[PDB]
Design a protein around this nucleic acid. Structure first.
Lengths: 63, 102, 46, 93, 77
RNA sequence: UACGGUGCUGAAGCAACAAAUGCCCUGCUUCCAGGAAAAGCCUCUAAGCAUCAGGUAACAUCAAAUCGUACCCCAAACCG
RNA sequence: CGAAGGUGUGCUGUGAGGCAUGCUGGAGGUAUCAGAAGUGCGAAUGCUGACAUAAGUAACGAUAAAGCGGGUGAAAAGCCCGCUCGCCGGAAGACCAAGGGUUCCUGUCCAACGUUAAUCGGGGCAGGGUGAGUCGACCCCUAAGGCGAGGCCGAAAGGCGUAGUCGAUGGGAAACAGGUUAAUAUUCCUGUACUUGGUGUUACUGCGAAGGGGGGACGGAGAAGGCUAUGUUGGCCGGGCG
RNA sequence: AGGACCGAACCGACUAAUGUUGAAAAAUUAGCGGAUGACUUGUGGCUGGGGGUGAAAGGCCAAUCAAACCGGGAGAUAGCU
RNA sequence: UAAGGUGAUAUGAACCGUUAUAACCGGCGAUUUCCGAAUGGGGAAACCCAGUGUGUUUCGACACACUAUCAUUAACUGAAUCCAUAGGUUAAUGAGGCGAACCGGGGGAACUGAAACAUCUAAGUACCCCGAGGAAAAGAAAUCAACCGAGAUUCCCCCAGUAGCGGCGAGCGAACGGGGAGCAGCCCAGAGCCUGAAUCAGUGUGUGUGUUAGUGGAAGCGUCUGGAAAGGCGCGCGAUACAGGGUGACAGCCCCGUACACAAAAAUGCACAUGCUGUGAGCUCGAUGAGUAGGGCGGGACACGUGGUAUCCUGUCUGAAUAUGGGGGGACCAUCCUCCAAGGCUAAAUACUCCUGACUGACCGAUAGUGAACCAGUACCGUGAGGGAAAGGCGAAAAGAAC
């Protein structure tokens, strides 16, 4: 997912931005630190995916 | 690129297994390879009180050097060195001595 | 008996601390020698 | 108001202990590890909006990191912040 | 500092020599005086710290040319 | 009563006298050696603003952030 | 089919030395003839490391002092519990500041640390623990003093200093009782409070300063008077009649 | 009233003994002086090396003082060991 | 580029990838908390406290940006005072700090040597301070030479431990001239003719080459000892490749490489070519650097210590001629020769190595070589500046010892 994020509008990367943080990131920090979450790789891939959305969002907004 | 690689059948050139064929299990970035049924060490490990306890003397394979193996030709039935040629933009390996692409 | 080192953090810092080495020419040369010698702690700050 | 991007990064873990446990089962307070730069307004707003409960008041201490060692190599852990979040009479989590 | 504002005369260094030739360090100082110069073109008194041969060169070159040199080299008067 | 305690219940709960180096007291008396400053605080107005702004009073409501808080501290934890 | 090195033996040269070989070792050595030297150690109160000697010797850190029973343990003079005994009690008690920085509390281990043993510990390992509108800091204000735009001065670096700006050891708003944790509490809980700002409504209304005045605002000693903390005794209440 | 008197805290340090590879690189014990003053103490500040400060001893200036400490000139120089 | 990866101690768990959007390598971007010149004010560095403006469909609270000083320039304001200057406000541009050596300049010791010591030496060294560059500095004759000539500066070898200076002690010590490295000349003080004429500087573009990833890269088997072969023995092959490193002992032919031949989407350094802008060629005529040269006094630099001392620099007092003129030619005068100060620019030869790459050593091999082969400027010591260690090697492979 790098062209897929590249082909939306600024509003839609703000939506999937807030959903990467909201649904994914926070619930996996809370789920990870409360004994659950066997699958730990999700933390990494979510974090890098927020990096992609902020990158494309900085590239799309202005310069 | 790398001459001996992952799913490949080799023969062993030096030591304890000289002339034994076998398939490469994996290949370690130390420049070593683990080849099945070849460099068998008799480890004996402790039954850790965590998840399952085998105990005993487990006979594993050890990593031999990449330079101690060469891939088995099977058209001549001997060891053979590997080169790299280009075919249709693909860098392919080929056997030396009959020049056959692998 | 009353030994010489009677510690105070405020006098340690006002005297030999970083904002007090940087405050003058010669303390900046002190910091330059401590960085050049390559030193884990330059001043005594904490 | 506090933006939601800030407000997600503040809460970090629920704190499990016996002081925490007796705080929940005896005085409505949930104890949780927060961001080190998180203020009490941020923690209150983030529990209001991320566990959808009603917070009465927050009390924040900062816990100092312990100097451990491996072998003969020391190291301080890391300071964190712990928030005693006193909820109202209607709560579950 | 003791610099003539016209000629640029710093204090220089030297030796007190004696009759036994014992060298000692000394400073030769310029004859710096603070004199107030009437400029007719501006109708004002510009006060300068001149030497006593900065006044010779002001008497010869004129005060306007000298002030043009000080304004030229960024000496503020 | 995992004898470690844990809950429940709980009477009287007054007076006299003595009394500080603490309080009235930043007082009072006295003495020369003649005993910080600036803000908060209370007031006065100038420029300005004048049926606005501001001030006062009552009521309501919101806010009071941040860092320290363990433990030793005449000492086996500080300086030796 | 065993190098250097190490350790013995035998032979040999006038000597420094050489040669052969057993055992250890486990991978390098080097003829001859030349070349270059960090080229030869017993001394330097030589430098560094190791190991002796006195020597199983002095000592084991206040002459406040211990005794017994029981428990745990592989093992108890020292740990835990109990009963006695002694010591401090204007301290050897309690609370802080400075300073330290997890030593606090719990479980667990006894290698080293503890001048002995240790099951114990301020030791090792792991987990826990520090909750504030009212306490303190930050903050507002300043003293000594620092720094200091401009500025005056000075070979350069820089010195001094005006406006200012910092600087507590001083001045400035407000919370007490009771309960609770193994470990925090004027912070948590219960009860009862108080303070300062913002905003809104309502009623009345002249408000307004890096400006004026007051106040803050402040010595040593002494003397009583009125109190309180606190204590003693009686009354009351509960228990005892040895 | 008092650089007043006796005497604890507090500041000091006159004598003796111990200690002198100490419990301690200056103390302990028993006595001793001052103890409302030219006192004592906390916190901060200022003075710096031929310089400070000194009720003056050449005392003190981080267990160092007839010229601190650190670094450098520097492998000073040593007709001496 | 790729069949394997998610850095190490350091294994695990959870996964990603295998013909291409795993991972790894490179170019260009994005993010880049706080402290630090630190720059909004302050401060005990990594913290405390703001102001101003813009925006925020819960705008009772948030988010972003700007706000240091100084120099220069401009605009608007603006005292004593009328005009005006000082001052004030705002904007634009630049600077500030760090860094090992080399370089120029401002200051500048003493121990030591003289077998004492004061002139002298050490020594314009150590050190302090300012400034600059990839080099700096110097530089285009008011220079030598010597009646012949040379032709800017810098560096090297002689000259030559020479002439000289010297309590004529200790010591200091040239130039002329010769041989080389390198070679380059110009502009303003000034008008007219004439214009873009060479010249460089700033940029675009094109070409060539280099850097930053890479690609291909020859040729061996049998037998004996052995734990293991690259070793012994026997027979082959490569070489524009027998530099080196690893592989279970010593490998040209096992592996990585080496010789050799190629490779860049992008960013770049250098060199040509070329577009634009700025800049000025060339001709005639004129001018041709005044508190200056020189002097008196004091001091310094010249190899030269005031001496018979030329020359240069100037703190102080003075003070010309200005091409029918002036400086020098080692006191000084005359004759003769040579040159044109009081304005400035200028490449190369030259000096150095914080840092990068490749290669090399009759350099060291763990008490050596860096203080530091190892998580070393660390532990530790000291208030501080500062001082400053010790410590490498199981094995071929952890098969690192089940029971």
């Amino acid at each position: 997912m790098k062209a897929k994020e590249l082909r939306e509008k600024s509003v839609e990367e703000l939506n999937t931005e807030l959903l990467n943080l909201l649904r994914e990131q926070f619930n996996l920090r809370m789920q990870a630190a409360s004994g659950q979450l066997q699958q730990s790789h999700l933390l990494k891939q979510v974090r890098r995916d927020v990096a992609r959305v902020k990158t494309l969002l900085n590239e799309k907004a202005g310069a | 690129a790398a001459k001996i690689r992952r799913d490949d059948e080799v023969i062993v050139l030096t030591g304890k297994d000289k002339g034994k064929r076998g398939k490469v299990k994996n290949v370690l970035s130390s420049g070593k390879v683990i080849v099945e049924g070849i460099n068998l060490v008799k480890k004996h490990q402790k039954p850790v009180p965590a998840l399952n306890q085998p105990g005993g003397i487990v006979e594993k394979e050890a990593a031999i050097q990449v330079s101690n193996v060469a891939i088995f030709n099977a058209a001549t039935g001997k060891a053979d060195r590997v080169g790299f040629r280009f075919e249709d933009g693909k860098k392919v390996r080929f056997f030396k001595s009959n020049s056959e692409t692998i | 008996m009353k030994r010489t080192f009677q510690p105070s953090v405020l006098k340690r810092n006002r005297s030999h601390g970083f904002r007090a080495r940087m405050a003058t020419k010669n303390g900046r040369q002190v910091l330059a020698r401590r960085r050049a010698k390559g030193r884990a702690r330059l001043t005594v700050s904490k | 108001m506090i933006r939601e991007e800030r407000l997600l990064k503040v809460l970090r873990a629920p704190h499990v202990s016996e002081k925490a446990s007796t705080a929940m089962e005896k005085s409505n307070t949930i104890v949780l590890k927060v961001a080190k730069d998180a203020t009490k307004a941020e923690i209150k707003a983030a529990v209001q909006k991320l566990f959808e409960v009603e917070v009465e008041v927050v009390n924040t201490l900062v816990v100092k990191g312990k100097v451990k060692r491996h072998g003969q190599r020391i190291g301080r852990r890391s300071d964190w912040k712990k928030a005693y979040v006193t909820l109202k009479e209607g709560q579950n989590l | 500092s003791r610099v003539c504002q016209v000629t640029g005369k710093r204090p220089v260094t030297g030796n007190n020599r004696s009759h036994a030739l014992n060298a000692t360090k000394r400073r030769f100082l310029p004859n710096l005086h603070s004199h107030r110069f009437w400029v007719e073109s501006e109708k004002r008194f510009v006060t300068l710290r001149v030497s006593a041969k900065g006044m010779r060169v002001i008497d010869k070159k004129g005060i306007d040319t000298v002030l043009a040199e000080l304004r030229a080299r960024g000496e503020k008067y």
